[PDB]
Design a protein around this ligand. Structure first.
Ligand code: NA
Ligand code: NA
Lengths: 360, 360
């Protein structure tokens, strides 16, 4: 006997990560003495305009703009896409869930391509949808032929596709995306890490494909993960319904103000992106030399390593955490054989390699 | 054709209110010269500790605590209820929707007692639930006998009950609430405005009633509407399921930091509440003298007026907006005959009354 819906009674929970203040208690270290490479956060922080704006919020006691129109105007200029195509969310996480709750009736089907962002499987479960897993190949590329086959057989309503992918950082070729867009399915391209690549954003494609959505975030390159602000490009025929169903005030005044302030400093954003891309190469080479790690090529701000040579990947992550360095390990069957190392400052890499050298 | 779920194609949108920056552009007035009494916001703002904390956020680039445990510890101290019973939301709005998402399959029934908070109807529609209406009496009291009868007839899953109610401010007495708690239904008591009354919060009652949830907010008395932080008390048998389905990071770092900072100044919170309660009495007497307004007694930070004597309520609100004063009008059938006036500073009341005189 419970008021809870049946499909939620055995829901597998999401496995989130924990911030510095909580880690400090668990690890017995001050925050400045913890190297945190488990959530793809930008260790340089956001542009200095952000903390100046956050400290001078004029109307914290007034509800935010339900249309986030100031930020959407800035995103229209930034992206080259008109503001009528743009929604802002409490993170891109809000938009992932919003799409599912507006498109998937209970029992509808969604395609997922693991190993990938585990939020898609979680959100599908919360929304009562049924996941069709079409695994990526060993090089993390999409199996386009099998996607076509399952779409024909089972008529799923949507597919989420990360590029650069989390957790390996590989990109989806234009021709693969175009082949999938020919299918009668809603395609959600998640460009959370696109700024770390030389590939252009496909936001503009939504004007030519009424079955494409493109999602973006301020949480990674822009250094605003704590403030919860993301956005996306949507076809006009979809966005009109999403506006009606979207919660009025999930995008806070701090979120809108911080994102607008970050966009005032393109030089800072480019410089921190370039520093992280440079360190990614140095980190890759250092990890490759470790005998029990096999890193994969990446276009993001993280490097995935297969853990080899009989080394226990979970124990590796736990041992490193005890030494003060956090990397990411997932328990999902598709991911548990890897660890994912975010790119930080050069000194963060140096601490990680020092800790690796003292293992066992 | 459309990817959007069928039930959302006919969805009536929520009617939100708009912040000072948007009103300034629409009305052609500086924010200083707009008197904003339409959203129950606290014009004094939050305690000074809030701006000091927001300007010194250490980790804006790091995800927030998915468990909001620091704030929950502070709320345990404030409420006398252990932290295991407490969830924090991106506003109480998040918790209202979370409860419905977790309890209502499409077609499940929810009881509503209008005239009341229109977010319950909106969220029921977004979630695909069926509303069972039991209107309040003309004095805004619940028709308890009719609730009992309709629960037997329709077998609903839950009921939301606001006290002090929005939009009139009346309280639900203990005898009536206990009678409803005897029913086989989940009862959600919305205490958004309880601090403006002399009635104690019923958060502690969740320990003796596993079909009671009590919701609260920082948006009103505490002056944090823009930061999006609310909370509630939940039975342990329910909260374990809600934790699993709750989005991991909707409560931002700014929300948790600002709420914790506000709780550090109970003197300020009490003083601003007392100033607003004092002005509520002055406003009530002034509105009562207006020949075409009939105010209702209130325990909140707003006063509802029936618009009488043939005066158009919508035109009244629009005429006042053209003079620089915003009050609340709803198009809903049960609400369109009234206007709702929030309690502000004394000077705000004085501007309102000047504008009312200019329409008489
Ligand atoms: Na190696
Ligand atoms: Na009167």
């Amino acid at each position: 006997d419970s008021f809870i819906r049946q499909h939620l009674r055995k829901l597998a929970p999401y496995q989130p990560i924990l911030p510095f203040e909580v880690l400090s208690s668990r690890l017995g270290r001050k925050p400045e003495d913890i190297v945190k490479l488990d959530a793809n956060e930008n260790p340089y922080g956001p542009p200095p305009e952000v903390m100046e704006a956050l400290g001078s919020i004029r109307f914290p006691y007034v509800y935010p703009d339900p249309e986030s129109r100031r930020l959407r105007a800035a995103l229209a200029q930034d992206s080259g896409l008109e503001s009528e195509y743009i929604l802002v969310g409490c993170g891109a996480d809000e938009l992932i869930d919003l799409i599912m709750r507006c498109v998937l009736d209970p029992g509808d089907k969604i395609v997922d391509c693991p190993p990938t962002f585990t939020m898609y499987e979680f959100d599908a479960a919360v929304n009562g949808a049924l996941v069709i897993k079409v695994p990526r190949r060993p090089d993390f590329s999409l199996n386009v032929e099998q996607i076509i086959e399952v779409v024909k057989q089972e008529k799923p309503k949507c597919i989420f596709l990360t590029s650069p992918n989390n957790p390996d950082g590989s990109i989806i070729d234009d021709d693969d995306l175009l082949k999938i867009l020919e299918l009668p399915i809603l395609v959600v391209l998640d460009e959370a890490y696109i700024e770390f690549s030389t590939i252009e954003s496909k936001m503009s494609w939504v004007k030519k494909h009424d079955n494409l959505i493109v999602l973006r975030t301020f949480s990674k390159r822009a250094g605003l993960a704590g403030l919860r602000v993301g956005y996306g490009a949507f076809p006009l025929s979809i966005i009109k319904y999403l506006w009606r169903a979207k919660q009025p005030y999930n995008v806070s005044v701090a979120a809108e103000i911080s994102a607008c302030a970050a966009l005032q400093n393109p030089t800072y954003l480019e410089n921190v992106k370039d520093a992280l891309v440079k360190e990614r190469g140095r980190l890759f080479d250092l990890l490759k030399a470790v005998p029990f790690l096999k890193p994969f090529p990446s276009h993001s701000n993280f490097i995935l390593c297969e853990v080899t040579s009989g080394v226990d990947p979970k124990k590796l992550k736990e041992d490193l955490a005890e030494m003060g360095v956090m990397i990411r390990h997932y328990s999902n069957k598709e991911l548990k054989g890897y660890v994912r190392v975010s790119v930080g400052k050069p000194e963060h890499t140096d601490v990680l390699m020092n800790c690796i050298s003292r293992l066992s």
